[PDB]
Structures are given as structure tokens and as C-alpha cells.
UniProtKB/Swiss-Prot annotation, chain A:
Annotated protein name in UniProt: Proliferating cell nuclear antigen
Keyword DNA damage: yes
Organism: Saccharomyces cerevisiae (strain ATCC 204508 / S288c) (Baker's yeast)
Residues represented out of the complete protein: 1 to 163 of 258
Domain of life: Eukaryota
Family according to the record: Belongs to the PCNA family.
GO cellular component, as recorded: chromosome, telomeric region; nucleus; PCNA complex; replication fork
Subunit structure: Homotrimer. Interacts with RAD30. Interacts with MCM10. Interacts with UBP10.
A GO term, aspect molecular function: DNA binding
Annotated DNA-binding residue span(s): 61-80
């Protein structure tokens, strides 16, 4: 019986960007300790994995695990109704057929109820992270962003080297 | 009041205290919700490294400020290349720490040298996660898919991407 409220629909709008562009479908597993989500790209070379904790919502309540696999392309449409700083709220029932999305903003100003019809997607969660990796680096995300962006002009295959 | 405490992985943890609150207490707190003991911790505000005896107001600190926190390891060359028909590209980066604004710093721990290639269409998808975090963590290995990771305020978004064989 899920009711999960983002203080600003921008966030979730952003997160779904990550999946869009490289994965069609995704199961969402809602739990009493928040949401997590997994999707594998089509060529099984890329896995997108998402974890969102209770502390990330304005309010969160989900007294019972529920899975929602959803068409991302569908869901994003619904997310354009977003305006970016409205209060988004996901809601679901015991056995869910539709998840309801619910935006409103400053006061009773405006309110907009949407439903996304859910689909049966088979849950094959992967647990692929290793304990030890050869190397680890962090760097400004837009620096990285820039590099990948430039070298993509020259070549289909960027190659990384650490020493 | 509240301050911002920025670590060198895009993480911005929140933290509340009192001017009277010493430089030995702040850094102990931090360790108390992000795993790093304060030994591994350096803060610097206004390029001044803070000291474990002085006082937050000493360093003139007020509310809604932004402190830089650094990593002190008790313990060289990242290269990116793309090379093909029309020509070839090369960006070379080295681990450093910035002073004015350390959130730009490059951290690196290398356990073994790594030499790996990845499809660019995949990386192009991946960098979209910029919009969720200042910083990105990247983990490479010959024995497994490389991890790319943007952290959220409580949670994260991860991309596992397998290197190419040939």
C-alpha cells in the first residue's frame, strides 16, 4: 500500500532520464526501506541499478513490498507533466494494476492525477558488484561528461588506461 | 545552524553544530555517518586548513556555509583515448587536490594498472547521470564489468558496463 512523496518532481524526473535512452523496461521494487530498481540493456552489456532511500522522499510509506515493472517511455511521458518543482507522489494498492502519480505544487494551486497501467515483467535481479576492483577513481561528473563527449566524435570505442 | 560538507565523490552530506563547536568535534561527527574516521579527514575553508584546537567562529564560520573535506590516505596517470578512422583523441588526467574548490579534485587508488575499452554509445548513455551528482565514482577491473556511480542524497544510481574483449 504505497504512498511515496518526492518534495520535487525534478528529482525523479532526473533519475528516470538515466534509464531512458538505454533501457526499455524496468521492475520497481518498493520496500519499507524505500525503492530500488534494476534494468539490463538489450545486448546484456549494460545494467542500470537504482537505489533510493526513505531519506530521499519528503514522505514515504510502504508497509508491504510491491513490484512495479513499467514502460519507461510511457512513464516519462507522464513525467513531462512535471514542471520540475511540483510535489510528485506515487501511490499503489495491495495488488496493483495501475500506479497513480500525483502532482501538486505551491498550495491548493493545482492538482493532477495520472495513472500508469503496469505490466508483468519477470524479476531476474542481478548482484554483479565485486568486492575488489583493480582501480578506483572519482572526478567531477561533468569533467567526465566532457571527456566521454569529445572522444565519442572520433571513435566508437573509447579505451581507459590507469597506471 | 546548518553547514554543507563536501567530500571528493560528489557527496554533499548535511551537518548541524555550534560556533563553540570545535574542529575536533565536527570531524568526529562526520566520521559518525559516512565511515571515514577523521584521521583520514582534512577540512579546509578559505584555503585555510582548519586545526583540531581552534574554534569555528575563530575561522569566522557562520550558517549555510560550505566546507571542503579531504581524504588523507595512509599509503599516477589516468588516460582516456579514442582512436579510429579520421584521427585520434587523448585526455590525460592525474590525481590532485584543489584548494579554492576541492569538489573539483581527482581521487584515485590504484591496486593494479588497468587497460580497458568500452563502447562509446554506452558511455554516452552513462554520462547522463551527471545531472544527479557533482561527482562520479568509477571502478575498473579486468575481471568484471566496470562500475560507474552517481550518489544521491541517500541512495544512488549505478551503471555496470562490460568492457569489450576485442
Amino acid at each position: 500500500m504505497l504512498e511515496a512523496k518526492f518534495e520535487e518532481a525534478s528529482l525523479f524526473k532526473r533519475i528516470i532520464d538515466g534509464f531512458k535512452d538505454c533501457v526499455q523496461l524496468v521492475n520497481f521494487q518498493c520496500k519499507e526501506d524505500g525503492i530500488i530498481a534494476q534494468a539490463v540493456d538489450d545486448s546484456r552489456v549494460l545494467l542500470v541499478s537504482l537505489e533510493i532511500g526513505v531519506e530521499a522522499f519528503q514522505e514515504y510509506r510502504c508497509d508491504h513490498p510491491v513490484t512495479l515493472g513499467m514502460d519507461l517511455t510511457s512513464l516519462s511521458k507522464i513525467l513531462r507533466c512535471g514542471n520540475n518543482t511540483d510535489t510528485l507522489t506515487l501511490i499503489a494498492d495491495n495488488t496493483p494494476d495501475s500506479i497513480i502519480l500525483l502532482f501538486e505544487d505551491t498550495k491548493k494551486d493545482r492538482i493532477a492525477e495520472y495513472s500508469l497501467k503496469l505490466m508483468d515483467i519477470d524479476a531476474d535481479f542481478l548482484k554483479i558488484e565485486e568486492l575488489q576492483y583493480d582501480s578506483t577513481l572519482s572526478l567531477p561528473s561533468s569533467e567526465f561528461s566532457k571527456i566521454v563527449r569529445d572522444l565519442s566524435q572520433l571513435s566508437d570505442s573509447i579505451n581507459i588506461m590507469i597506471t | 545552524m546548518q553547514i554543507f560538507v563536501k567530500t571528493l565523490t560528489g557527496k554533499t552530506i548535511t551537518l548541524e553544530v555550534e560556533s563553540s563547536d570545535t574542529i575536533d568535534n565536527v570531524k568526529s561527527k562526520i566520521q559518525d555517518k559516512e565511515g571515514i574516521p577523521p584521521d583520514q579527514q582534512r577540512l579546509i575553508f578559505a584555503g585555510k586548513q582548519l586545526e583540531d584546537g581552534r574554534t569555528l567562529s575563530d575561522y569566522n564560520i557562520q550558517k549555510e556555509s560550505t566546507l571542503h573535506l579531504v581524504l588523507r590516505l595512509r599509503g599516477e596517470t589516468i588516460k582516456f583515448v579514442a582512436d579510429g578512422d579520421i584521427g585520434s583523441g587523448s585526455v590525460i588526467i592525474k590525481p590532485f587536490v584543489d584548494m579554492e574548490h576541492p569538489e573539483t579534485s581527482i581521487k584515485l587508488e590504484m591496486d593494479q594498472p588497468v587497460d580497458l575499452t568500452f563502447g562509446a554509445k554506452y558511455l554516452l548513455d552513462i554520462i547522463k547521470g551527471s545531472s544527479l551528482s557533482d561527482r562520479v565514482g568509477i571502478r575498473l577491473s579486468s575481471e568484471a564489468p566496470a562500475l560507474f556511480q552517481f550518489d544521491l542524497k541517500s541512495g544512488f544510481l549505478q551503471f555496470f558496463l562490460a568492457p569489450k574483449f576485442n
